[PDB]
Amino acid sequence: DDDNTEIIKSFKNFILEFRLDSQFIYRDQLRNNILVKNYSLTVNMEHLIGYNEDIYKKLSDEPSDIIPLFETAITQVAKRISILSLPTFQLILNSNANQIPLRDLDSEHVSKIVRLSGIIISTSVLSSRATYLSIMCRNCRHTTSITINNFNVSLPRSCLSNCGPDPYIIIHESSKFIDQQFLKLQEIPELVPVGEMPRNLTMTCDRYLTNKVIPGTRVTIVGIYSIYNSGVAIRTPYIKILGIQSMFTEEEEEEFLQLSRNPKLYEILTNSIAPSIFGNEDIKKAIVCLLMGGSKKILPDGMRLRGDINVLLLAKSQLLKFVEKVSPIAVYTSGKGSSAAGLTASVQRREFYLEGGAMVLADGGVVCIDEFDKMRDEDRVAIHEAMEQQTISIAKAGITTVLNSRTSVLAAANTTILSRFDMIFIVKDDHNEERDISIANHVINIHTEISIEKMKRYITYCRLKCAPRLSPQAAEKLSSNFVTIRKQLLINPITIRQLEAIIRITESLAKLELSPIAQERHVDEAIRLFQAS
Amino acid sequence: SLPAHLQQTFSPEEIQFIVENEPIKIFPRITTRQTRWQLITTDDKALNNMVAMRSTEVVLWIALLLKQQSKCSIVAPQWLTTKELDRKIQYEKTHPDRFSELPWNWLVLARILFNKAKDDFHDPIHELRGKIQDLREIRQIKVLKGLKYLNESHLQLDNLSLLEINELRPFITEIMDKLREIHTASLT
Amino acid sequence: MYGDLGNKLVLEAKRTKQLYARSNQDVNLPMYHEDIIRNILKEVSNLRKNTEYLKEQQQLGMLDDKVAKCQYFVTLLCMERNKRCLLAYQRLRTDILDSMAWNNNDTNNLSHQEQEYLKEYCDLITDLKSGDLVDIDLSGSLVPPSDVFIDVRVLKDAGEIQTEYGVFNLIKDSQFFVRQSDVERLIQQGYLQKI
Amino acid sequence: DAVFGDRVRRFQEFLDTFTSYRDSVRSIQVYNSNNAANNILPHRIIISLDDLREFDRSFWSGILVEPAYFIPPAEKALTDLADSMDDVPHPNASAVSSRHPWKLSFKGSFGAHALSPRTLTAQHLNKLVSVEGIVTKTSLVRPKLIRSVHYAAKTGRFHYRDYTDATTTLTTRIPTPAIYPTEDTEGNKLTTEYGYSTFIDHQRITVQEMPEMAPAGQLPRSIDVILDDDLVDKTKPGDRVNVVGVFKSLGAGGMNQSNSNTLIGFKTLILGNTVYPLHAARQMLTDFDIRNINKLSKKKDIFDILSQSLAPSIYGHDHIKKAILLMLMGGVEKNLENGSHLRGDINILMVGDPSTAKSQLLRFVLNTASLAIATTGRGSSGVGLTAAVTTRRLEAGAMVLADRGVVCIDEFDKMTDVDRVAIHEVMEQQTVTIAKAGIHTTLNARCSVIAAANPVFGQYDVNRDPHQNIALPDSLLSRFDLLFVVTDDINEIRDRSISEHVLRT
Amino acid sequence: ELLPYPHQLMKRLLNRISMQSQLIENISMGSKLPLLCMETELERLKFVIRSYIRCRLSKIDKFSLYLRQLNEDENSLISLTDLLSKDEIKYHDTHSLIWLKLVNDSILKYMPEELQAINDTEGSVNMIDE
Amino acid sequence: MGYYDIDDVLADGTEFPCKFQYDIPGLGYLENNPGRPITKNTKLSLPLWLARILAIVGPVPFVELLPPDMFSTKVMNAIKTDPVALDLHSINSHFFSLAIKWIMLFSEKELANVVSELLLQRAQELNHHASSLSITNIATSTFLLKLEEMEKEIYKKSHESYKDTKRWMFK
Amino acid sequence: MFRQSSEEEKKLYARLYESKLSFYDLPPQGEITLEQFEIWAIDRLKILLEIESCLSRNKSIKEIETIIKPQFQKLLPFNTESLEDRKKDYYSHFILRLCFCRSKELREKFVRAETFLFKIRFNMLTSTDQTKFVQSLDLQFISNEEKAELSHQLYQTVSASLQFQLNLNEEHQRKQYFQQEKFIKLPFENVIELVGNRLVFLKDGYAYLPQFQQLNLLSNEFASKLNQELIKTYQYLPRLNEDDRLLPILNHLSSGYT
Ligand SMILES: Nc1ncnc2c1ncn2[C@@H]1O[C@H](COP(=O)(O)OP(=O)(O)NP(=O)(O)O)[C@@H](O)[C@H]1O
Ligand SMILES: [Mg+2]
């Protein structure tokens, strides 16, 4: 009976007295946590060992029994430093003891503190556990209560106030609960013995340790290793977790603004794109416009005006990879697609279902296709809606839905399908031996202007800050040019769907300067670059 | 002209400078009584007329200057002892709104003497460092209750230390000013 | 409308204030917006032309009691709100320059009127610093003196240098035991650290 | 126990002070009492939670933080108010002991307790909350026993008893065995009086967070809701909805002896107190709207004003705009006395050159009609466009879903012949009928069809017959009321006008 | 507000500083510790005056037009020379001319004659702070 | 409320709804058409530095001010139920400046009583997050995204004050 | 810790109705109209006529409360902040003093009806208002030791009453309530109606009364003081005879009771 009080007294005196130099680090942490309504304390093992090794010995021998005593000691201190009501505080631990590989845990480790690491592969939804709980006695209608704590219980049968063999029921109307979550940990990929699939464990956490990690992340864990019921005299193992480890500034945009006022910025960005590829000036210019895009608009009668750009390329393999690297969001694929969804989408089967290809998945970003001629039959017809409407719509086998396809397409190949693109160009080659020798020397080196990340961040900044508008001079210029080309063709086609493409290119050119208005300077280069032919 | 962080307030360095002008009691280990000090902001007679192991009173900055070397020893103030600090904590607990009557420089002087003069105390220093903390924590509770009475007119405070006031100054004055602006705007 | 350019210009004042306040060591106030200011002044000139034309129509008798009064009055407000924006922006950059003048007593971002303004204010500071009250170094340190003697380590090879107290030889990564009142200026210049 | 009485008194003071709730009680009562002498309105009232705050903060926070202790006495007081007001005499046997009190509902300013299924957390248990999401599942409606009445054969005395279950009450009571008593305390054999007993309706649903809010492709989260009495069947799957109710827990949670080592948690629910839809179509007119509509109708040329106000961002094509307006108004549907039916709804087709705003104009109808479904001609099959079999259950297609609405079909020329012929019934008989293994049924499909297509040769050829340019059978073209041909004829002033227009746009 | 300058105190203090400096030099040219105390005391004294004068000049920057208007009012109950020291008077006067020249040429040269005043009270916003 | 104050300069440029009481020639540029008159009972959205005068100068003054959406009844009920949870930053970036200007303009009594309580109740949690110093980021960062531009300055000058004191003590 | 720091007639009636009921203790002041005098008197008279009619029909307190409570909002409002309602109530009572002081039969009828109305309105109060009203009237509880010594007798006396009047059917609930209940000691002659029904415990000429009972003492004090005030009112009726314009109204008011 007295041992429960001496242990609590000891951990209480630990928190009140541990100085390193001149700051009572655990008193300060416990106070600073309460002010932001965080009811927990993060103790470090090495400090506990330094203070008194006997306390650590008791904790190391019987953790399931002693962790609750230390938690209630924290509550008793929390009241003195803040009251002249609070829940029970959660204890959290940090440690540097030797990691055990997950594959070596065995019967020698049951009910011991264990430190390990791995990859999280799954996460459950949250669930409710009881801490303070109220009871009603069915016969006499007397009432009482119980206090649960979550360490390795059932309803009692000692009836009170004969009173019967099993008379107790729960008053959910006057009881207290906490959150609980389950996780799965898989052993590290670079540890697994050859020819075997990795082993994994299941584990539990509650209160502030919940909702702290997501699938696919590598983590380190401190927790009690134990067993639970679910052959003869045999039980399943698991872990109880006690700790886990895993927009612009002003000085950034000042650089982007200095770039914006450079008189040769257009040349600089074109030079910075796939610099190993010789020649092909207009290809690089078109990729800049594809990355920057026009401006989206919405009208009073609800009609909606597209912002994206689309380009086709007829050496060429390198540019799509470069675009994939520089773009803020990107998807890469070959014409057959990643599944029976193809490029656009399809219905599959047993009940029917639907899945989207690599037009739906790239929504909001850029998508690049590596051989557009290898497009499947259904995609040949479906890409018309995907490009003109920025949607895909299906009404088959009782499915009736519409999918978003808001993206800019880059494509390459080697017909009427060319009409869907804003610009089309044919890649050109040159055969200087020095270029191949330089490439070969670099290949041997690995076997034995603006940088990508800065350019990607700049493109992001420009897309977020500016969406410019045509000046009246540009309108007169464009309309005069439009009727001039149609008249020239008539005396010897251009159509509105291409005028509205020239406008988007013009806006994308003005966007580099961050000029809020587009000007004749941009219109001239737009029509100059329009020579796809 | 003046820095932005000194427009309305004193930094802790200036607070230390202000506290350093107070007198303190010392035991010198040398006799100066029959060159002479010839100071211009203080008395000069006390330093010129020292006798070894005879108690005397000087400004704190000179006292710390001497204690840097062998030549001097500093007597702790009488409030800075275990018995008195026990009584002040009991006063703090007994009267849940009043502040106990500690001197206006208690925090600053404690954290100067514990660094420069750890050897000259009679009590064990590891207990004083605990009781000072207890006092500061209780006073912080009482402060947090008081910030629910910021108003358009005024407030009264008692026995709150200089450093404790200076810690809170830019919050109290700002919120109080805006309540005043909102109220007077409705009168006009 | 006539206030849009002002509402755009003042955002640069707010931006440069926050950039300046974030890092006291990194003061380089940005390019003066000559083009926006010129556009605002051109707008004011347009409004002046409109008021002058309206005064001609008033002298012609074109319903001048009500019509000229209301149109003139409304135009006057549009001019005043532009004056306020321009003065606010220029006053902010002036405060920054005044702050630098006290420590210093490069030029390309300042407008030429500002370039002569800074020189004028430097002359004023040295006039105050000279003459009577010279005994206290008005451009010196504002942090109270804590210690007489300190230990300082040698960060940059400036070689042999002269100072009012004497001569120093700044042998890279040597260490001095010396009075602070001497080396305060060299610490501010950045040849030394306190360790 | 005594506190219950004082809470009833305090809510009575509220009901006397804010008089707009008395008018609500009385108006429902007089309406129900009128038509009973010849539909009936529910015994339910919605209170503004703001009025209660301004009346008494101590009662407001009590309702909002301890609903199990404040909602029952408040609801009791409402019933006393409605009962003391005058009511029809000589009630029938079933009316005398209905066990049917009035019920409350809430609106306005939930503050911190306005939530979503992802963020509902164990801290919020037993609080009154508001959640938002999409309905995903609904149970069948079931009746539930709450009271039964019995007649004792010898003594001539009518007896009764009441039943409870954990989802029927906010406060907690000993559960009841659902047994009917056969014999009296005094040994008399009993009989059960159905029709005097009381049963109520019950339905469970599930609500999930909206897909627009799902993070990182992670699994979405959801809650189950309990509905009863009046709230049953007011929703269907796919509805966006906002639900108000008490968040509560249930059951023994494995502490009644189980193999789980109590790792499993307790069960939880929301008890539906009020339900509101979300607009994501319909509007309700104010008096001023009726006045403006009637006044505008007396202009000399209302048809021109209205037609030109459709898609003003599209230049030209006056006649197609007028045709679309007449389609949106429609004819009048006739049913003759012998059961014979005559069609009322207008179908329109337009075929033409590339880029001539066909798809752009077709897109406008989808955003001004009250019910509209859109599809591309090659992305849809005959069965998917009309109806399909599943498991036997029969599942509706797009033309069955838009019943009294409009269906838009783009790229109509790409639809296969096998798909087109499924439409021949729907555009005249306005029904769908299936005769397949284990099924025979007829379904209703009354919509108007509007569609766009490309001519056979890629551009319209005036030097060949219209049948050569338009490859569709005569029996299908006959079903479209208006067939429009449109082309991109090159002309200077036309080009200039259109280009200047799009640039101004 | 800007409080009135202590004219007499400053004269006496600055004279005392000069005399103490010469005394320190004479004793230095003639135990170490007394010199230590004297030197650091003079540093402590000079710091306070430096801070005080910098604060007053900062107040004069912010209320320049207000002080000028207070001086121009012939009916004022206090003269500007009562409030400020001679050095402060020089700073106020010449700094006002420097600032005035900068805005007068840059902005106000372009404004119509009704809006060319810098210290206008009658406009839709008061141009004088206090 | 100083002349050269940037925040005051910037807050006066917010637009408020207005209605005219006279037809006037040539002022159609306010309606973005310089070639036309303004006509009586037309409604427009004008910046406060202009509407504050046209509502006063005469008699009947030229413009009448309509009750703006940022002082609507829904906002007042949101304020009075839970002031600490409220996202004032989304309602309007400069709320406590415009509130005082509107109070001066119409001499409102009840609005002043609502706004005083709102400020006093939010100052509490602002001090809590100011006092809490590391020896956490998410818990603080969620509330500090709902502060006005007015409140951010008070938070910054409080946090720096506590931090400087803490640094000096433990040194 | 931090720290900061005729109209008289209206204040009089605010004070008189802070308790929500009054013994009608004090002389009214200022003026009202003669139409108001007649109408206010008739309104209170209608309520008291219905109270006497129901009592002559031998109806219970609950039935009378169901009958009379809807009439307050029309004739004589209660639980109200309105100065007009408060003046109407106060003045109407004082007017009917002058109408019903005239004879022993009229005094008895008026005292009976007004005391029953007092009982009704007291039942409408919250327990806090009842406590404050009783405390405002300057109205001996026994010691805990005396309660312990007499606990068996007191519990035997009140146990049935706790079950029937407070619905405490469980003996456990009765014991808990009795442990929390206070008792009053006074001479048995003061509560003789409870004595005749054996609802109080008697010892040495003193009756022991639980706190949840004893409202009959309050209403009896109201009735007794009203009777004495009516006797006084009767003695100075010759001063009422100086304004003739009031006597027809008072004759009309009394005629409905004769
Ligand atoms: N007045 C107009 N006349 C013609 N086209 C216009 C007009 N105004 C805009 N457009 C544009 O014309 C383009 C093509 O319109 P759209 O409706 O897709 O043509 P379409 O008839 O569907 N051509 P298609 O998809 O090849 O069958 C869009 O980008 C419209 O914005
Ligand atoms: Mg199209």
Ligand SMILES: [Zn+2]
């Ligand atoms: Zn029992």
